Design a protein around this ligand. Structure first.
Ligand SMILES: CNC(=O)COc1cc2cc(Nc3nc(N4C[C@H](C)C[C@H](C)C4)ncc3Cl)ccc2n(C)c1=O
Ligand SMILES: CNC(=O)COc1cc2cc(Nc3nc(N4C[C@H](C)C[C@H](C)C4)ncc3Cl)ccc2n(C)c1=O
Lengths: 122, 122
């Protein structure tokens, strides 16, 4: 029927991360407290429920700058933004709470589910 | 060190395909002979060498419409565009030549490599 390429999706995500690193077609700036993070709107919607809900709306779709709440941990958002482009989540006892709280706000249910499994096993 | 999410990259590609289907943040129109195809510039660069070379250039980065050569097979490009968002390539004896020639023009080396293996086995 159709030939399946097992490592194609991982190769696409790696190339999207290379474009983000080189600032190619990054159409949004995420402001967390005092820290700024440039990313692709499409990647944000695909991994986050909050970013999907914001960018589907035509009033917020063309927004160049998205200002998140100052209560949101900058290191927590950075770990989650890195995870979106690499599929690797840096979860440790020193950041577990900061990552879990940020994943709840960004509406990343599967990340919250793994954060639930992390402190259950540790 | 870092927790690996094996199906994250496939879930991202599936969501990007859902956005393409719903015309959310599709910033380019690809014109093949008389057929039109809307896609994301970032997805094109990630899977194609030709689209990477075009959109890295600042003179062609903001181009809303990309006109390919009329010699390019519309069904051949459609199969390859579908593959970019699904990781599934529809290669059969009736389209093998049309897909191989289009993959060469779009500079998709791994697709050309699988097209090489297809007629070698059939
Ligand atoms: C480890 N991975 C994660 O944690 C990812 O978690 C999440 C990702 C996530 C993505 C989106 N984005 C889209 N959602 C749809 N659809 C919605 C589905 C419920 C139904 C489907 C038809 C369309 N389409 C296109 C996008 Cl871009 C919406 C909500 C999301 N939520 C709530 C998540 O928890
Ligand atoms: C089944 N899959 C395929 O057929 C995909 O095939 C191809 C994909 C492809 C992608 C790009 N795009 C980028 N290439 C880099 N780098 C280049 C690498 C050679 C070195 C690396 C550091 C950066 N970065 C960011 C993008 Cl978006 C360039 C050329 C490409 N060519 C020649 C392909 O044949």
């Amino acid at each position: 029927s159709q030939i399946q390429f097992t490592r194609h999706a991982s190769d696409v995500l790696l190339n999207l991360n290379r474009l983000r690193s080189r600032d190619i077609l990054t159409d949004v700036v995420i402001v967390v407290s005092r820290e700024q993070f440039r990313a692709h709107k499409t990647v944000l919607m695909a991994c986050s429920g909050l970013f999907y809900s914001i960018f589907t709306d035509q009033l917020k779709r063309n927004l160049s700058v998205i200002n998140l709440d100052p209560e949101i941990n900058p290191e927590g958002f950075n770990i989650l933004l890195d995870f979106m482009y690499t599929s690797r989540l840096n979860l440790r006892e020193g950041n577990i709470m900061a990552v879990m709280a940020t994943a709840m706000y960004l509406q990343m249910e599967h990340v919250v589910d793994t954060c639930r499994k992390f402190i259950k096993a540790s």
